[PDB]
Amino acid sequence: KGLNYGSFTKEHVLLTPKGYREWVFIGASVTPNELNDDKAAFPEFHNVYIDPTSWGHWKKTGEFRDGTVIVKELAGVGSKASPSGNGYFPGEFNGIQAMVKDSKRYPERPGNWAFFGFESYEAKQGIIQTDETCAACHKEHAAHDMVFTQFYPVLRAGKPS
Amino acid sequence: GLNYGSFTKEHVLLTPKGYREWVFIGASVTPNELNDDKAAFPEFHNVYIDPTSWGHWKKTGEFRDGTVIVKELAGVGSKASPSGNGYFPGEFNGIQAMVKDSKRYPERPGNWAFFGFESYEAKQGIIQTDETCAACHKEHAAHDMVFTQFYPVLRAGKP
Numbered sequence: 285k286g287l288n289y290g291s292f293t294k295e296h297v298l299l300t301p302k303g304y305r306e307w308v309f310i311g312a313s314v315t316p317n318e319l320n321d322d323k324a325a326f327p328e329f330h331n332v333y334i335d336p337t338s339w340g341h342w343k344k345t346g347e348f349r350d351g352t353v354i355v356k357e358l359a360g361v362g363s364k365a366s367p368s369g370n371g372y373f374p375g376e377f378n379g380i381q382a383m384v385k386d387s388k389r390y391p392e393r394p395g396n397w398a399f400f401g402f403e404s405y406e407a408k409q410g411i412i413q414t415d416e417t418c419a420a421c422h423k424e425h426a427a428h429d430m431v432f433t434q435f436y437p438v439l440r441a442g443k444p445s
Numbered sequence: 446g447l448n449y450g451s452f453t454k455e456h457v458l459l460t461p462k463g464y465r466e467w468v469f470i471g472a473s474v475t476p477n478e479l480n481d482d483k484a485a486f487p488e489f490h491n492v493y494i495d496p497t498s499w500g501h502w503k504k505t506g507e508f509r510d511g512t513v514i515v516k517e518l519a520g521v522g523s524k525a526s527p528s529g530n531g532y533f534p535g536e537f538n539g540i541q542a543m544v545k546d547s548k549r550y551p552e553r554p555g556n557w558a559f560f561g562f563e564s565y566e567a568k569q570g571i572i573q574t575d576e577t578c579a580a581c582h583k584e585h586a587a588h589d590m591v592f593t594q595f596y597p598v599l600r601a602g603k604p
């Protein structure tokens with residue numbers, strides 16, 4: 285049996301995840317403000333994690349099990365140049381988004397993914413999102429089961445032959 | 446709570462396996478196009494610290510003997526996505542590492558050994574002279590030769 289990494293309210297809302305920084309990192313991208321008219325949709329660095337149980341299952345199957353939790357952690361750009369050269373380097377943490385795959389808890393949602401926003405790191409739980417607010421952009425464009433695995437080299441290298 | 450990374454008899458670091466399941470501490474990007482088409486370390490960098498040393502870090506805010514840090518390099522795969530403009534990873538390029546050991550590296554700056562790797566198929570690392578790597582880390586890293594000003598996981602996790 286595998287361990288369940290998310291905790292949920294009676295209404296199936298994901299409680300604010302603790303310890304996700306010790307989950308399995310799958311990739312990082314950066315949409316800086318200065319390259320998006322000074323207001324990026326999701327500022328700015330994005331560090332992404334999958335719970336360890338679903339990583340074991342992805343390692344053996346290449347699919348996201350029932351119970352997958354993915355957390356995307358946002359951080360600011362801290363600087364543009366360092367002794368290694370020019371670019372983007374992280375500053376401080378900004379917030380988190382999450383998505384959860386569960387046919388039992390979300391049978392009507394596209395892919396059985398529930399997308400969660402979080403009003404702060406202090407909040408008790410996430411806020412479940414409307415289909416147009418998140419799932420639409422992901423189904424339209426993500427490379428596998430509504431997860432942008434074209435940007436998770438850890439997942440592509442870790443899936444079986 | 447045992448040591449990670451394995452070593453030869455000369456205590457040269459064997460190529461670490463499974464470091465993608467260690468604790469990630471931050472990512473940066475130096476694209477080629479912002480560095481006269483040839484970044485010193487192309488391009489994305491994803492950095493990991495071994496679980497035992499992460500544990501000791503949450504308690505003490507210090508790197509213990511036996512700390513292993515892996516910097517994994519990857520290419521920029523694209524500059525625009527539905528989330529907007531920026532940089533997005535592509536394929537993996539290689540790895541660098543550093544190991545702290547007061548016993549085995551007593552005459553290295555901070556007792557850190559620095560390891561380069563010829564390719565993912567190399568069986569072991571190549572220990573570097575202090576001029577090649579430790580000089581730059583010593584001059585500029587925020588804490589004990591590690592660029593913790595770029596690892597927010599480490600900064601938020603110390604007591």
Ligand code: HEC
Pocket residue numbers: 313314315330332354355356381382383399400401413417418419421422426430431432433435526527528529
């Ligand atoms: C990254 C994201 C993740 C991480 C897993 C993944 O599917 O990649 C989550 C949990 C999440 N977002 Fe999503 N999102 C988009 C793109 C291109 C990426 C990867 C590249 C990057 O990090 O920049 C995402 C795209 C979009 C998008 C296109 C216009 C929309 C409208 C959204 N995302 C919306 C949402 C959410 C609604 C508030 C939400 C909770 C998300 N995304 C979660």
Ligand code: HEC
Pocket residue numbers: 366367368473474475490492514515516541542543559560561573577578579581582586590591592593595
């Ligand atoms: C990142 C690095 C790491 C990760 C841990 C850390 O201290 O950040 C390792 C294990 C490593 N490098 Fe080093 N390096 C430099 C900078 C600014 C950063 C963090 C920001 C980023 O990811 O870009 C590093 C700087 C330099 C440098 C300045 C001119 C030189 C000459 C080197 N690094 C050299 C080396 C190595 C010699 C081959 C080597 C094994 C390194 N770095 C390992």
